[PDB]
Symmetry: C4
Amino acid sequence: TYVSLADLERAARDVLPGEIFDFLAGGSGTEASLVANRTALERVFVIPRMLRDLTDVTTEIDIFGRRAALPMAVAPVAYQRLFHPEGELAVARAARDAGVPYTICTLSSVSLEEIAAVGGRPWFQLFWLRDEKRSLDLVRRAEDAGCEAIVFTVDVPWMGRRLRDMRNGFALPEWVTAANFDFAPATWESVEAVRAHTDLPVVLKGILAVEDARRAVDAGAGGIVVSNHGGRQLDGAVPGIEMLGEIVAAVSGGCEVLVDGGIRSGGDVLKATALGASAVLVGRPVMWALAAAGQDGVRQLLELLAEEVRDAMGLAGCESVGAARRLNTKLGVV
Amino acid sequence: TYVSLADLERAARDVLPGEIFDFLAGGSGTEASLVANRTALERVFVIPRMLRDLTDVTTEIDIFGRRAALPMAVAPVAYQRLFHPEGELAVARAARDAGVPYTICTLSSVSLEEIAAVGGRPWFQLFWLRDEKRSLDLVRRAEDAGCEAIVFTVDVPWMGRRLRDMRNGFALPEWVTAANFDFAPATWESVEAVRAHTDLPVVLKGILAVEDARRAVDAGAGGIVVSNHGGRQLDGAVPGIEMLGEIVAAVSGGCEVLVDGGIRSGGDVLKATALGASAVLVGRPVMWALAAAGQDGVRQLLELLAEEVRDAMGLAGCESVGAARRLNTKLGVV
Amino acid sequence: TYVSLADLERAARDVLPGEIFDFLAGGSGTEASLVANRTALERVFVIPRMLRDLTDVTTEIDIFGRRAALPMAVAPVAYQRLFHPEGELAVARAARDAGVPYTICTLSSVSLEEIAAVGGRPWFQLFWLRDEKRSLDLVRRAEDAGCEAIVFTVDVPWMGRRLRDMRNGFALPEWVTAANFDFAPATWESVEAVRAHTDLPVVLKGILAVEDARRAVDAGAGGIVVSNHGGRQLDGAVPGIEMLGEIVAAVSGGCEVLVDGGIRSGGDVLKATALGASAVLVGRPVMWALAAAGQDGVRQLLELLAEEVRDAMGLAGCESVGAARRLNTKLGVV
Amino acid sequence: TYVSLADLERAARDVLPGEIFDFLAGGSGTEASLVANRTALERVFVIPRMLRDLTDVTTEIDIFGRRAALPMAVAPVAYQRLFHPEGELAVARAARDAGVPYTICTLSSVSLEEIAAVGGRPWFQLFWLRDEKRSLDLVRRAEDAGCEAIVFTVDVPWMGRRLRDMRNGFALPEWVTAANFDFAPATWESVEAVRAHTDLPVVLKGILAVEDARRAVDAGAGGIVVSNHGGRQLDGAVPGIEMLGEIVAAVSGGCEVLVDGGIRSGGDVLKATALGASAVLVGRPVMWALAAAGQDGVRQLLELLAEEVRDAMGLAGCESVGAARRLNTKLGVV
Ligand SMILES: Cc1cc2nc3c(=O)[nH]c(=O)nc-3n(C[C@H](O)[C@H](O)[C@H](O)COP(=O)(O)O)c2cc1C
Ligand SMILES: Cc1cc2nc3c(=O)[nH]c(=O)nc-3n(C[C@H](O)[C@H](O)[C@H](O)COP(=O)(O)O)c2cc1C
Ligand SMILES: Cc1cc2nc3c(=O)[nH]c(=O)nc-3n(C[C@H](O)[C@H](O)[C@H](O)COP(=O)(O)O)c2cc1C
Ligand SMILES: Cc1cc2nc3c(=O)[nH]c(=O)nc-3n(C[C@H](O)[C@H](O)[C@H](O)COP(=O)(O)O)c2cc1C
């Protein structure tokens, strides 16, 4: 019986080999951006409303043409067999059962077609390959398999310098592979190539600059994820949560605006919503639950988050996520 | 001989069973709002005035048609028999003797009529019940027993997630019951039903949004308590002390504006007053005194607070609470 | 060979009985204002100037018609025989030899006439007595003995609540007495009575509100000391250093504006000057030096401060204290 | 295999005698400015750009008429034989091989002509001597030896009070001397004398005030280094990084604007660039590498920095240093 997401981290730490825990937990450089994701959320306080009608409180949203049970999706995390033998299938099954979209990775350790076969609301995360033709074939595979959005990761021209992994000499075990296979920096031209080759909504993940958010809308993106990649890419990149309010104002409803980085409770989901987010992604906590107890662990995590989101919304006087978006916030200290 | 309110916490910790101490001390979630109540007060510095006439320094106020000895009332705290066998009677007696209003709880462990019989300035705190008729009968009982205000708690559509209590598996002992008995979310319609059924001032406890404060005045409230429920309801709710100045400006004398959360000295009372509060509520410290030494403990606490309030006022050049409200403040760090 | 003022605190702690060290070190309440005096100085950074003429660097100022060797005076500290058998005579002698004004206390443990006989630039600090006539006789004694300013302490309607002293049960030893004798709250009328009865400059010590600074000028004060009494009076009073810039602007040269609280180096003196102070008072460090090594200890402290002030001024491109007052500052963190 | 600059500090601490490590690490006074250099960098977050062309990422700049491989030069650090027997020759050789300018010190422990003979891009740092004629002869020597800029240090009218060195009784060993020999405060007249006597660009090191930056341009400086001398001069001097943005705006391209103090990674170089710096100087880390492993150590440090700079630039969407200068930043906490 886990009562917070932090209960799951302790459990994952006990079970995982240190180098794998470090691959999961770590960030780039001095981990300044990793820590700042948490610091930034902790500075935000919500101004709750009272005495509103809560007879029909609902945490549901519509996003990319589909109902989701919560304003949340499972973030793309590569190589989930690192954490549990069932890997992506355990996570996707639990996500399906919870009514939460699951993001299938380019670097999944089970093939995208197998994960999509689980059902639910799968999205597909794209890393741009060596040549346009292979990238587009990967998008086509995902679309053919029933994925409902393409989450194009745009903050990885190359992978950041993760010093825990360098110090550990971390490498994939032989029993974990990139199952979609037997990369080059993306540009705005790559985005256009993807947009031209699919009817699915294209979601640009890793936007932090206001003008990049505007340009994403102009480029025909259906959404963006305001994100510093969990502090794993540029060390010193601003937390997404700190850019979110400015970005939401600038796009002025032109696309869905998601955020990630450090979401660790329903209260944090509420903060993100109050700052203007359509929805959040959650990464590391899902993997802690997977490591701790497989599919059942992820189910328990999603049930806990669902309860915390409903609790936070109602306590703040919000019968819907739309109402939560209209909450005001105040910045505090420590 | 206690010289600060913190002397009483140490004493209460020694005597109380851990799970009861945790029920008293704890907040919801990560306890961010609990801690922020203290942090926020610690950031406020007063700009004292010098060389004023202090020949007749008085800490008295008039509130809801009655003189009070200090700008303070005992906050509603449920189930006071948890802390001492005399429970609410010990606290109400000490409050009476000190000239401080005592708030009788809906969830009192001694009946409201017995506590009101003690005398003094009893107020009655309402939680909205299952149906209008039982709620209003509770208000009528309180009024018939001589309670002088109805403190309608508006920040509890349901109880928050107190993780200490969940981890402890905390439950009321068999010897503690809700003595007023053998709940549903309140709305603005509930407030109107209460206002229509009593001549007593209705005070809305748990207001944080400026527009909710304005609407409280428009709804015919005689007062509000600007409060995050001691960090026990929404984890991440702004501290009341941080909204107080804005709220005081917005209501512009249309109702009494009280504050609570983390008041732990006469200096803190002065800070609250300087930010515009009519009066404060004090919760946990009263219960520490009750646990430590029963009625005599609460008397000693109230005597200590009275001395600290008079000391702080005079040192700041204020011969009256009204003068303290005209003090300016400056925000600092740590 | 002491290289910082902090070397002297360690030495004083070793030699003094704990309760006496606590009388010296302590503040009122939770010691929030005591700590904030240091925090506030630590937040201030100086913007030094380069490449100026430093051929004739001088730390001298003119204040209340007399040259002083540094922009500094010894603060009034009662009962200096607590710290060393020679008490006030040791401190006054060292101050004289260093060219620094010494403030003789109303509650001195050696008579004001004996201390004034030492020579140098004595000032006299007044606490307002029971009746106008005794207060004025004390002022007349000081003037007759050759004191050159009256430092009227205006932040002590009564003494603050020093919890270290209460916990220790601290009392003066039989061998320490108020040697000027065999009190009531001061008002603006008291200030006028003093101003009318002396040709000496009257300096109001303990001003924090901007309007009190203006009123001090209007009342005919020759100076003010912007001060929270070393955090010993109102716990939660703003540090003087945080009000200094606003106060300097408001009086616009109408009187001398001194500051105290937490000055612990020549760099701190420079910060105070850059914020607009005419001069600083230094309290506790002088007593650490007295406790550590008597008159010689105070001489060494004043020599160290003199070197640090000259060093800081020159490094900041200031050939005079007037130039230091024209330096700009920037607030930082921790 | 060092993966961060902090790996080199640990290695230098192990090998160096404590008093030499302290000479290197220490600052003046309480070391407030030393610590603030790091604090200030840690507060800066970069807003990276995405999806830009990175086909030809280059870290090169042109400065003072010469290409440099990175926007970085080795700061002037006196007496490098303190740290390794090869001293300045080891550092200059590694700098040459890395394509980074090396600043030869007035107080070098190997003669300026020997160090310049190493080749590369040597600059020469000037301390103003006793008389104009010797100062100018030193400038002429440097110019004759092929130095390409004169870095006139302007923040040392005299040396600051380094308390670690005073406590240690630190003195140069007999085997370390000022090899350029067998000082007086600089002024603007000194700057003019230097500018009139050389065709080399004159760079004023130790500017913090905006008006001093403007006056440097008016005086014919080719550059400035915005710097508090690594917290070794005025204790309480603002960090250069905190003045940089204001200074860059004020000079509006009239000279090169460099910064130093606490640069410890390629991410920090990126922050400095984003705040408007043309280039940075790096001091202590170069000496840690020298102490740890001589010339090879410095080579490894410069290779690590080069990789971190390229990584940070690309992750932030910058194909050139000019692009990095156009990045925006956001201030955060801790
Ligand atoms: C172990 C690990 C692997 C990741 N793999 C990917 C990936 O393949 N693609 C991607 O776009 N993001 C990846 N991310 C970033 C996440 O999608 C997400 O942005 C980040 O974890 C921030 O969320 P968190 O604090 O909830 O973990 C990964 C993160 C982690 C920790
Ligand atoms: C143990 C406990 C029980 C409480 N019970 C109630 C209650 O029944 N009704 C209510 O309106 N507030 C209740 N409160 C909230 C208090 O009235 C008050 O808002 C809160 O304790 C903040 O004040 P403090 O920091 O002085 O404790 C309770 C608080 C505590 C700690
Ligand atoms: C032990 C002690 C005794 C003091 N006595 C007096 C006094 O008699 N009159 C007065 O105006 N201030 C008195 N002060 C306040 C000082 O004059 C000064 O305002 C305060 O110490 C702040 O300076 P510091 O941080 O340099 O100690 C006293 C302070 C201390 C610590
Ligand atoms: C041991 C030591 C010696 C130094 N010697 C000089 C010098 O001779 N001339 C000079 O202009 N700066 C000197 N500096 C200052 C550096 O050039 C530079 O401004 C400072 O170290 C800040 O950079 P850092 O944090 O990268 O060390 C010295 C610094 C150190 C630590």
